[PDB]
Subunit: 121 residues, 4 copies
């Protein structure tokens, strides 16, 4: 993969990948593992989000991509998706701001840059 | 995607994709969603497997690929993996045989054939 | 390949690949072989164009892609290029209109649809 | 691209790309341009080989890939081909040994490592 690493659930600023994406690039992502978004026995989340026996608001406690401070859904993974903005790829466990203190665990994530933007001319 | 569809947790024989894979092909898979592998409130599973607060034996209640009656790990997804055997791709919720009766729900899965085998000559 | 076939040099309307493309798709192409754009011994062309010892105007007697009646350079090939317009992919030996009658031969061309447009959201 | 650069026709040892390939990787290549394999006005070659109005023996004056001192056809390009041996990718204008002194020009070549070997398990 172009980047592989952990995404800690307690990282409020996310995990920086160092991948500098440009508008028009395409990427794929797969995310593995489990994290806690709280201390309770039920407050587990996959990258796709909280276990549905304790659901949270939309996009909360899911794996998202942050690019130029805009957030995009990733969850368990995405295949060959076009990047609409420039910026470094930050992978973020999208917990409510200020509530990362009771989080633990990390996802294992792989990112592939499938293509760099170049149009037909 | 080359194939997108549901993989029911209660399907003991899995979900046939119709994709005929050859040794040397490469594929990518991403799987989303939640299933129950039992009627208890804790018996939830992501494609990666059971929620860790109620763990099961290795590979049980995970999403796997069946090709020529061999099983391969898939879970939440894989990127650009080489197919080692010829056969139709079957996607299977790998519950213990005979225990699919209390399963429910389905994963949403996407499969892409990234390349068909062709060697440098 | 998603499409493989011969592109005749004397086909003033090009060769249909049957591939229906959408803006934002990415494609790769490789083209092999040799054609004649005239009866003279010097009037050979690779997909990239005429041999430089008998140059023709820009883009003339080169392999191009025709989509929605717009022309894009292909030549010997392109890798993971973004498609800017919807339409059927036509491959065309871009000879001067009305001068296809003295052409002969065909390029062997392979086309791969690397991805179908799907943005991060 | 993973590597893009020039392949001089007069480089008897070829052009080292620095790409370290492993058995099972897949690669794509496209090659553009024209070179001379001799001082005569007719001794032009595309990556696919000599212009057919002055043909040479089979495989001579064609663009090939050298991996572990073995030669593989490339010509104008290849798409998603599996690498059969470990080694650095060397791109070579395959002229007769000792006859590179009368060559000039260079091909413009792009190489993409489409995937790094990882099997389903
Ligand atoms: C409802 O509380 C739980 O979920 C929220 C997010 O909605 C926070 O993560 C909090 O730490 C956790 O205990
Ligand atoms: C421990 O029981 C639970 O898990 C097993 C597999 O380990 C079966 O799926 C069963 O249906 C479910 O109730
Ligand atoms: C100089 O003429 C040559 O090139 C032109 C295109 O410019 C036509 O293909 C013509 O048939 C061919 O003989
Ligand atoms: C027949 O001569 C020509 O072709 C051979 C290879 O076949 C050599 O490249 C030589 O330099 C060139 O002049
Ligand atoms: Ca929290
Ligand atoms: Ca069960
Ligand atoms: Ca002509
Ligand atoms: Ca020579």
């Amino acid at each position: 993969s172009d980047w592989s690493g952990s995404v800690p659930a307690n990282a409020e600023n996310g995990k920086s990948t160092g991948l500098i994406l440009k508008q028009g690039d395409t990427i794929s992502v797969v995310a593995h593992g489990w994290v806690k978004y709280g201390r309770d026995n039920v407050e587990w989340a996959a990258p796709d989000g909280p276990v549905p026996n304790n659901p949270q608001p939309s996009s909360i406690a899911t794996l998202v991509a942050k690019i130029a401070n805009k957030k995009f859904a990733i969850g368990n993974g995405v295949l060959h998706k076009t990047v609409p903005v420039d910026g470094e790829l930050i992978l973020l466990f999208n917990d409510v701001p200020g509530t990362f203190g009771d989080n633990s665990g990390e996802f294992q994530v792989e990112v592939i840059i499938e293509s760099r933007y170049s149009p037909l001319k």
